[PDB]
Amino acid sequence: QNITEEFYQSTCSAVSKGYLGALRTGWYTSVITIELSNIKENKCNGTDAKVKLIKQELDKYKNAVTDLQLLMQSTPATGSGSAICSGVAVCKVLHLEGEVNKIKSALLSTNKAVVSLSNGPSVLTSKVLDLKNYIDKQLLPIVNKQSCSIPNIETVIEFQQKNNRLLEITREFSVNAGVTTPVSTYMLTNSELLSLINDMPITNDQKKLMSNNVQIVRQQSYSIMCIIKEEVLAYVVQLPLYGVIDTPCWKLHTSPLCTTNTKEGSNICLTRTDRGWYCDNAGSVSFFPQAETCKVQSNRVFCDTMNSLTLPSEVNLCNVDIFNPKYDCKIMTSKTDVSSSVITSLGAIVSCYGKTKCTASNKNRGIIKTFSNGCDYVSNKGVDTVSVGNTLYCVNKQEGQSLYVKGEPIINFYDPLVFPSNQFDASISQVNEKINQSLAFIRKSDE
Amino acid sequence: QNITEEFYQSTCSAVSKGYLGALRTGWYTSVITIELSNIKENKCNGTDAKVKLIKQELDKYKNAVTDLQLLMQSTPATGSGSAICSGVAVCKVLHLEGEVNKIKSALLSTNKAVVSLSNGPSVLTSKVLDLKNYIDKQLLPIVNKQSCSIPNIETVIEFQQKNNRLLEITREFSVNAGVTTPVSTYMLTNSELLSLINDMPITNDQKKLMSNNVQIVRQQSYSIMCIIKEEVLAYVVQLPLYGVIDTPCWKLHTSPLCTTNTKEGSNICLTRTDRGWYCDNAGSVSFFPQAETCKVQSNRVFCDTMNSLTLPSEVNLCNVDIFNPKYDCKIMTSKTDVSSSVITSLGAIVSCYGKTKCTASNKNRGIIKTFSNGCDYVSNKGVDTVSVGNTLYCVNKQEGQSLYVKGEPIINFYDPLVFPSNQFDASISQVNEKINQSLAFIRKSDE
Amino acid sequence: QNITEEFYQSTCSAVSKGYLGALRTGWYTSVITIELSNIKENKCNGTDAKVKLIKQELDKYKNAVTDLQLLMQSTPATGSGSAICSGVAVCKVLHLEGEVNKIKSALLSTNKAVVSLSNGPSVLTSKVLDLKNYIDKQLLPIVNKQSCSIPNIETVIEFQQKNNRLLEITREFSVNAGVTTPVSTYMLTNSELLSLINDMPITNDQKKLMSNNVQIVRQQSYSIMCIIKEEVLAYVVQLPLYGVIDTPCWKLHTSPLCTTNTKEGSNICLTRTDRGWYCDNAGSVSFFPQAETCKVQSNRVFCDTMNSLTLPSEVNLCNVDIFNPKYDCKIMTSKTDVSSSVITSLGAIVSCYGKTKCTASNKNRGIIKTFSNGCDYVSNKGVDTVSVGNTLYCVNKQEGQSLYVKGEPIINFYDPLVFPSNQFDASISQVNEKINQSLAFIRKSDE
Numbered sequence A, B, C: 001q002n003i004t005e006e007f008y009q010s011t012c013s014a015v016s017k018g019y020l021g022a023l024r025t026g027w028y029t030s031v032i033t034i035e036l037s038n039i040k041e042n043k044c045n046g047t048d049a050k051v052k053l054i055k056q057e058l059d060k061y062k063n064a065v066t067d068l069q070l071l072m073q074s075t076p077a078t079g080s081g082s083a084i085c086s087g088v089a090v091c092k093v094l095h096l097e098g099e100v101n102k103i104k105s106a107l108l109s110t111n112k113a114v115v116s117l118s119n120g121p122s123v124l125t126s127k128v129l130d131l132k133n134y135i136d137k138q139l140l141p142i143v144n145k146q147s148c149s150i151p152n153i154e155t156v157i158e159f160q161q162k163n164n165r166l167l168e169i170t171r172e173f174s175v176n177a178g179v180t181t182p183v184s185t186y187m188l189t190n191s192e193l194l195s196l197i198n199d200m201p202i203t204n205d206q207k208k209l210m211s212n213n214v215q216i217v218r219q220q221s222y223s224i225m226c227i228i229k230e231e232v233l234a235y236v237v238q239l240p241l242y243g244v245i246d247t248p249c250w251k252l253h254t255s256p257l258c259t260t261n262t263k264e265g266s267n268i269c270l271t272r273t274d275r276g277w278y279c280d281n282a283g284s285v286s287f288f289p290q291a292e293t294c295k296v297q298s299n300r301v302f303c304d305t306m307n308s309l310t311l312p313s314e315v316n317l318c319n320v321d322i323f324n325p326k327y328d329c330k331i332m333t334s335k336t337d338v339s340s341s342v343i344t345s346l347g348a349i350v351s352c353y354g355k356t357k358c359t360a361s362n363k364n365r366g367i368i369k370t371f372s373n374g375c376d377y378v379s380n381k382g383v384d385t386v387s388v389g390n391t392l393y394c395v396n397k398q399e400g401q402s403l404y405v406k407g408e409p410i411i412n413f414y415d416p417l418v419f420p421s422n423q424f425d426a427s428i429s430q431v432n433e434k435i436n437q438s439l440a441f442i443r444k445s446d447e
């Protein structure tokens, strides 16, 4: 893992390079079945406590079954509808007549089986729980008589253990309108997930990747409820396919860059916009503005292209030349010089203004650097914490090399009188045009 | 269900009509009691494992009881205080002396009972768990001797099952400062909720509505902890009363509308503001800006007026004439032409700019539409996915009719030199006044 | 508890005073160990149901152990890395050879013990669960033979109870990448937390404070996973140290202040910015802009300085003189006069504009106050609810004294023609300078 960082003194921004990205570009759906028992209440003369315990657990089984039924009778729309059409397409096929009977026959003797549906896909189905065999074989002879037979206490415990997975799956599907993410161990055990990864149409290097990051895989997966019909509970798990592997990725960090005059009210500020994760993707750059869309593990990043923006690759030139014409680099302006700090991958940017006490300390040496007014940076080599005012941040102690790219702060190139200080989604060149417009009103009204 | 949609080419916005709204306007509180056992530790000479299991579960019962006590001794304020005064008013009455004794007497023989409190309301109380009868009858003869009696293994399992609901209710009330939402199956089982709906002072059509959408009802309900006193645990469930039923509701979708010049830096943008859910409400329009405030089920919408804004009904004319003087329609401006798409109820708005590759595909036919630069729309009829750059969205496959309302994009009516490009919460007429002000500075400085 | 409030009619803002703050300034780490059993599968000829139940629970024990191992083999970075360096420093020491053996020896006979690590700290270690003794003593004689011995049903239940805490701790550490907050009862029981508070190097008054607010303490704590190695599961709990106790704190509430002309489009608005919690802190003021960073219990506030801004104490003069030169008080401007209300600690600010029906009611008297157009305030004395349009808010019924500070609304001091209506993070003096600039263009172009 070659993680490196670059602080640009001129724009008060840093870029953390060297990350290998795995971008989600496709979906792999799989059908998960639970064999249920079509057992209407069959209540008999019962008294001894083992029978009461069985009848109680049996009512919890019926309530979970009717709840999954009212969940499929009326399914509320979810904010995930734009990401689940593939798994939903499998559920719509399962609703066809005879289709639940097909998977019901293929999984008659085995747990796993490939099934060609009436919509063509050769989908892979599994069978993680068998309640029809247990209730109809171990319980009906106990409840299908004039008076109930006495089950042994081992059966009471075994039925509470088996029925448990059904109750938790019904709880998640009910509170989330049939669509859950991340995918829990109740929907798919770690053992079942690794077996599903092994059976995926991916390279052996991708199976090793998803198997070594199962929690991230779970967080980028969906579990979709299909149907309860004819003693079968089926639901689709939608797993990520990372069509982009090992693509270069980097993270942009930005902090306010103000002037440091001694008279308050005479200072102007500037901040680069669009901080977050950038990855090379198909001749363009995929930008992820939201913080939860990229999970990081050491050297590696796992992003979902669902919540990304597609930018031309020239967007990276804002990191090397912000005044560069191939790309209109974006900034925001204000006159709000409040001190702050940003913890980067290998150090910390500190924007210190006013009377704020900014410093960087080592746990055993004490304060090793005092920041003056302006925007500065310190590496994690020898630094443990950074204090800005009354706030103390912890520096990431990850190994890597930092580079301080010295340069004049670009905020000094601007005349304060004509500066646009109210700008939000503004470009470097847009700001220069507003300055030419305020300068033309004085050029004409001097001549 | 008559769901229809209208895309306005002129403003790059769409309106999804035909939804029937159910707006929350009132609250129905109900008291939920759990009979507890005032049993101080009564530890005796115990050794056999059944006694250990009982004593362990009994300590978990005392810790849950003392935790509910420290929860009512000091109750942290919650961000829900502006929505729970009705249920809280019932809890303040329960704290009166003799009032817990009243409900304790009315529920002596039955589970449900109406109780007239010392604040007048005829409230409906229930009794979902009876631990006083079970501990004092089944457990004290086992622990109230010199040496403990041996309980059978059926009692150990039955006590872990009954004590379980207490522990989960105490967990939710403890982590949430006594106020939980949504209302879980631990606070109120699906069986108890449907019975509470049946006993509500609502029409039979509203009971069928809440009973068919119990999860949405749960998400729009509160469970408030009252008091633990004199062998009684009481808490109030605050359920929604939908005074507005079947009111017309619609959803506004907006997307950036920019000019498409070939020289970057010469383009101006405009976006309609206030996207979200609108419902007719009491001679006005209730607007819901936040995304989680309206749950949708097929044709129907369930909103809470707690987080809504009240607008004049003329706000709908921004959908028919945005240049119309009865209402100052709102826009935001910029020069940020980044491509994007919005998945609507029956199609997709696509704002394509620059070199971005925007398209709409069918699963079996491939690309069926390529968007050019500007703002456009495509219906879900025959369309499965929409790609903008490296991002792929899924189109909602819901049945309904779309209408493409052709019209000149209003961004073309604006001169770029005098356009206000930094506007956030700006009106159509506000922007026109800023244009008259920049045009007067050139009219006077030409004459 | 002396809670008081002050409404400033001139700026449409209120300040709730009298709160005693407890600001987190340090961390107290403690090591929590669980003795595990290094037991490879030792599967034997087993058939009777008690053996099946044991073997099932034993596989759930191994899966939880391997999951904690893959969690420590690859630990994903978390957004909490800037707040956990202290507890992480203890985990890095535990990874040293012989260091897990040290705590393994000190806790050989007792549950609690102070341990001097190979990094100096005298840390306090505990031992909350002993699975090595239970599996190796109660289970291996049952599974380490040619054919498995029959365990009694008491052992099956006791092992499911003991193994349970391991499975829930592994679930939380797995889904959260080894760092959880708040700290659950699974990580640390209420009994263990109070005992940890008693053993803390704090005054007796701080132990009473944290013990009376354990849920807030839990919400401001972290549980960090260390290592699984040599039959020991260790994880660090990072508890808050409140170096600031009983410091004066107050909460600023702001609401839009517009003009009330009868011709729409001629009104200008202004809103004070930086609403939230303020606390005196080390010669400065700690401001908390985010809503979840301060938990309130009656009179008291518990904040974390991690997400605060440090402001000069002159920031309070925006509450007494907003036109005052020692501090540049901040405002935002617009022309968006939409009615709204803010529920304060002791009353409600109501900003009423247009045709909106704003009122304040008592539950038994009905409407007791009708607001006219402008910004106004009403105390909670005699008031239960406040209605703005179709929205009804509940007034906090907390006891305290309100003071209505009468004054001319400052929005009336501004000429509408030259007002800057697009301002976001703007100062009072910044706005005055933009007004001098628009007035100079007319002074020179009249002369």
Ligand SMILES: *[C@@H]1O[C@H](CO)[C@@H](O)[C@H](O)[C@H]1NC(C)=O
Binding pocket: A432, A433, A435, A436
């Ligand atoms: C003003 O416009 C000219 C175009 O001739 C350009 O070269 C110059 O950079 C502009 N001024 C500023 C301050 O950007």
Ligand SMILES: *[C@@H]1O[C@H](CO)[C@@H](O)[C@H](O)[C@H]1NC(C)=O
Binding pocket: B432, B433, B435, B436
């Ligand atoms: C300028 O003001 C006049 C008022 O006489 C108005 O009719 C016109 O629409 C305004 N101009 C623009 C571009 O809105």
Ligand SMILES: *[C@@H]1O[C@H](CO)[C@@H](O)[C@H](O)[C@H]1NC(C)=O
Binding pocket: C432, C433, C435, C436
């Ligand atoms: C204009 O500038 C002068 C400085 O001489 C200042 O005193 C005055 O307050 C400014 N005007 C406004 C409206 O703030």
